[PDB]
Symmetry: D2
Subunit: 445 residues, 4 copies
């Protein structure tokens, strides 16, 4: 009435209450109605949010995701909950249980992947478990015992089948795999996707989120759904995808996340006496992908670039993905200072009209910028969380703390939206988004 913002204790309670209310038993939905299934990197953040509440339940979330891992090691980006419709494309559309030789038995999953933040979740679970004593450490250690092999096969499938040429960058076959469906990053690559005779379909996402300004366009879904046909045509075979996919991009943000993830998992590997060969491979991949990320960077600004494998050209766009090198490290000293100056200046966190000192998903001074349209400009708490956590890991304590503080100030309305209008702070997209409650729960301590 005079202040509709919640106290930190109220906010934490409401966040935990949302997370438990989205739990179907062994998996947590990403959002009640818009995303009523398990999503891959959402589940990682959800496990980060459960770790303060229940190490046992946080571990279960990851167990459920890994039970859906493909025979080649790929973690698919959706694990469908039994009987739940209302999300398109659903399991019938992917038809992975029919066509994919590597699809898991008695789980319905999608046929593409999503970024490897999972090792970060494992670290948070272990750090929480160490503060809780003997029996709770045993739960988390038993999880490592049971799942170390599966985490390795996840990291090895990325390194070996999505970086076939040892370039230290991850190749994607769908914008969905980047986590940033309609980012300006992929526009020119999608412009070259000319769909054929696409089996007719009817969206479900914009029945729930009805504002057209907040979701992709019907022209964009036509390209998204046509890439699926191309995959279905080759039965999702890794060896055949390079030859048939109309969309092939190296994703520098995904690559930087993978480098961090390998480094995190290698340190876990040493602390818990995992095999030396695995630890050595993880450090190898962390350095390889650190270097591949750095190779994309503007020698002046340090901004990281995506690469269109088909067009054979660098993708120059002004999104938060430019800051990938800050996550994983490796830039020369001068180039990193310039990139931090870009991050803090008028083109991103320093823009005079922003309500919060947070990272907009696209630069407000970019021609591509749209204040309400999903990844084309809104501020996403999940990015705030990932940048903050990675910055703290770099030693940039005060930078990390400013992002956390502004992110809590933004979240303190209690909507738990997935993204926010960068100028007015209006919550957008789905409310009750699980990974926004998780970010809040992890921040509050």
């Amino acid at each position: 009435p005079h202040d509709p913002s919640f106290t930190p204790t109220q906010l934490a309670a409401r966040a935990a209450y949302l997370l438990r209310g989205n739990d179907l038993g062994t998996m947590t939905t990403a959002a009640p109605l818009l995303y009523p299934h398990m999503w891959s990197w959402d589940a990682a953040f959800v496990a980060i949010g459960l770790a303060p509440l229940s190490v046992e339940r946080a571990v279960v979330e990851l167990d459920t995701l890994l039970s859906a891992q493909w025979r080649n090691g790929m973690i698919p980006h959706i694990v469908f909950a039994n009987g739940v419709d209302g999300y398109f494309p659903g399991p019938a559309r992917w038809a992975t249980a029919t066509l994919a030789d590597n699809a898991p038995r008695n789980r319905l999953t999608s046929g593409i992947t999503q970024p490897p933040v999972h090792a970060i979740a494992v670290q948070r679970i272990l750090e929480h478990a160490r503060t809780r004593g003997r029996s709770t450490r045993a739960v988390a250690e038993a999880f490592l015992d049971r799942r170390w092999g599966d985490l390795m096969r996840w990291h090895r499938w990325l390194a070996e089948c999505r970086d076939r040429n040892e370039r230290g960058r991850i190749t994607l076959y769908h914008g969905w795999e980047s986590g940033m469906d309609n980012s300006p990053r992929w526009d020119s690559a999608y412009a070259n996707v000319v769909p054929g005779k696409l089996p007719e379909y009817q969206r479900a996402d914009n029945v729930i989120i009805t504002d057209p300004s907040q979701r992709p366009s019907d022209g964009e879904y036509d390209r998204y759904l046509w890439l699926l046909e191309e995959m279905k045509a080759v039965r999702y075979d890794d060896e055949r995808l390079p030859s048939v996919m109309s969309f092939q991009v190296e994703d520098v943000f995904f690559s930087a996340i993978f480098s961090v993830a390998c480094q995190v998992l290698a340190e876990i590997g040493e602390d818990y006496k995992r095999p030396h060969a695995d630890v050595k491979d993880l450090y190898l991949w962390a350095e390889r992908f650190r270097a591949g990320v750095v190779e994309t960077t503007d020698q002046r600004t340090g901004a990281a670039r995506d690469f269109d494998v088909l067009a054979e050209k660098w993708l120059v766009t002004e999104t938060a993905a430019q800051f990938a090198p800050l996550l994983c490290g490796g830039l020369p000293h001068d180039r990193e200072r310039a990139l931090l100056k870009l991050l803090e200046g008028p083109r991103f966190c320093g823009h005079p009209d922003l309500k919060y000192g947070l990272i907009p998903s696209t630069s407000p001074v970019s021609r591509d910028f749209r204040p309400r349209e999903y990844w084309r400009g809104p501020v996403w708490p999940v990015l705030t969380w990932l940048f903050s956590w990675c910055f703290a890991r770099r030693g940039w304590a005060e930078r990390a703390r400013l992002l956390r503080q502004e992110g809590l100030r933004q979240a303190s309305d209690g909507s738990f939206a997935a993204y926010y209008e960068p100028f007015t702070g209006e919550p957008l997209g789905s409310m009750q988004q699980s990974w926004t409650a998780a970010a809040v729960l992890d921040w509050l301590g």
Copy 2:
């Protein structure tokens, strides 16, 4: 490892997480396995705990309890969840759906009552709703519209059928109705309960809580279960119970709670323009029960006494029920100072061996005292909460704040036990007790 206590934000999140994990949909269990149904005054406290998380869901909890109200107005102390066994005595044992003309249709309930803290819950819901704006106030106001009549019939059934002689004290026909099953208060009244040929039975409560020191004795359950037979024999008829029950006591703590509750509901009645006749009746009952409570008190110490209606004598015991007059008011000035001195001195909160400055359920210097045995000595957070809240209502801000502070310090292990050992602080009884999470959620703000 060095400090297994949670931060206030961690504690609030864990409390909300427990409450949602105990929600079956429209009702919240009192504890996961020991009490897997809805209990009456537990549900009131649960609604207090839900009010910071969701006014809509808090209101639903009370709606579900009131849907189980009997035709004469009585709120029964258990509302059984469909299909759930593992609590004895269950619905088959009560047989209320068969024998009780006033039992509700399509709800299975017990046949006895429990204290009227419900109006207190309504106040907390309204106070929360007023801080949340237009649409949330409308939810809470619509609840008053829909349930004011049911709350009146609850209060009127207590005033008219459990105080038949207008003594301003509530008569009970079972120790369970007091909320304090095995309190020393009822020992001499139970000594006069000589059971007949009691249909054989097997407990469930001490299969779950296996420490015999923490639950009543088999001799005590034999008396508890024999009173049920006597009620069943007269088909739970109000008019016939005075003539047949082997246990008839006026409960001064219950009476004081009813006085407060009438006062609270009368003020709600005025603020929301309820009928004048109802408001006038509520103020009448609050004064009548204030006076009946005061009439029981030691003219020196102010300690309130229960009354054995059958033996026709005052029950002098040294439990926290002695402090009933502090809840509702009405003592002469000198007598209240003496009662507060008793509360703060070596016999209760001032006892030198207590871990926390909290109210033990029985005085540690009493011969009846048992440090682990349920209501014979342990510290109960639900009592801490009720005393604190009532003290604040009396204007005793600093007293209330000390109880809240010690109660949070006690709860900060995160067990959410129903009672604690008064000397060592060991959590006892059931963990994951819903009303202990609710107390914590209400305190933290």
Copy 3:
């Protein structure tokens, strides 16, 4: 910075830092440059703010003020610091050292009084001291032994010399004694003050606060200063002031405070075994001034009126002093509901343009309202504190909490201003005002 507000720990730290910065050694200035001496009711709030920091130093503050008490029991409203200039009217202009037979012998002070909030500060000191252990309890109990007689003579002087006709209201001979210099309450009384040959003077207050819209006018100071001449002419003789003073009002807000103070001090007397005859007198005065406040009240709204003794008429103004009866109690239930409704509705706390849900010194819909002008409209943290504390003592826990929370939100800029613009929140008057830091500390310490 996107938000200039401090966290609770930063704010508490900054408030304590301020309070110690204003410490001259044995007295705390009311503000660094505007008020560089000890003021009487500021010193009580300073003692309250010191008590979470140091019971010993809080006791010293009251000891110093009480060492300046007059021989007849009056506590003067200013105790000047040795050799300190920069405030007018200074010691020279009051001439109490050469003229007042009752002025203290080794202290320079003013010649008029101020509200008796002192017993409230003694209660807060005692409440802190009991949480701090035995040597701290002993410090507080030794202050009681040393000063109980002085506090009694303070209250007795008010009850006997400023309520000569036992009307249960306090007579003021200067608007400064009300604590609200330029309140609209006193305009019609001040219109009947006609200065004679007033010795020339130069103001110092508006040299420091230069914005003329925040301080009284020259015309108003002409009358304030002439009243000093009338008192000097009769050498501050208690007996002669009814016959010579051109200003004589019964202050209903001062009277209500005295009622509370008497009741608080009587309860201290009982707890600490002070003479029964003293406690009885205090309870007698508490009741008399409660009744005296209620006799002024409007029959429809319960609003309290001041009385102009010279003109024999009730003073009807729309200022925060109308809510005096909420402080001391006494109104019939129906009239206090009306008065609470006036406090919360659109004329005070509920006015739609107010930035904070707080009590403006004058109603914004009154013709007397000026948003910048001292006591004619601005919101004063010190009044928020006093109403919050009195409301909690009435048992209005939620009301007291809402005032505290809005008070903290307003104070969270760290300006510690004496008063604030009610619509914009602009800090006004002196920054670094000791009693505003003291309010914040009590609300948080």
Copy 4:
């Protein structure tokens, strides 16, 4: 009281109150009676604790200390307050005013130095100042303009005059310069100090701290004071001390601090456009002293050793200074894991008898350990702070957080003692130690 610990707001308030109480105007005493002057590295921590309270006053603290800098760039370890007695050795005993050609002209100071934590305080001031807006930024930037040259001459004096052979370690001529007077690190060096005709003296430190188990022995003071005679004999001439001093050690902990300080100051120089030649020198010294620290390290555990220059041997002791390499970095990955394992295991933080998970000044399993005796065992909040801050800068967020939390839990008694008994938590040394209040404020402000 059942728990003597303060809430975070009360603690922050009490720490700020203390810091202002020790303020003499332009300098803060290190403690009220034991150390009633300005100490050099205490003044840096005081600046850090002042920065959340007042950037202007924090800048003044450093300005005052830097106004006492010698003409050759040395910052002396004591700046005496005018006319203040009560500490020995006082200005008379040092005789720097009459003897030291480089002593400042309008300040009385000591003749030896102390660790260069000052650049860390400048970073904290700058970090606070950027959150506070433009006039505060301008205050901090103007301090940089005024004092950048003085900070450069401070670091240059250390790099050139105390590392004459460019070994990348700092040479001390007095155990007091290490900040750890009686550390076991220096015992074998002090055994080779043989006093000649030492002018008689009377201690003042153990008049204030009377418990002889908390301070050094007379024998130890005999050697501390004789070293002053050796320096006086050559008039504190930098060039002559290698030839005359009976004490010459390379302090590896001081060296690591200087490495960090150089790196922090170089980053400030870049951000604020200071001369490139200065920034290059700072990065050069940061690398040189990093390498110099790593060259001392044990090949199995990574533990750093001090060097006795006169005897030409590594000093192997088990004190917190072994963990110097954790501060500045430089160790091979495998050796730093071993060193972290030593820090956390049963010889330091993981010792089973420690009350708090904190770093004892000497390992409890060492033969040199004394639980009460100054730097021979007690836990010092100031070291907790420095390790926590350095650990966060390394990117060890969770490690830094655990030290902070245990540090706050230990400080929550409000004693603000300089050091604590490691097993019982008893506060020791001087209460009201300014740098302990400063640690708490930084951890909370």
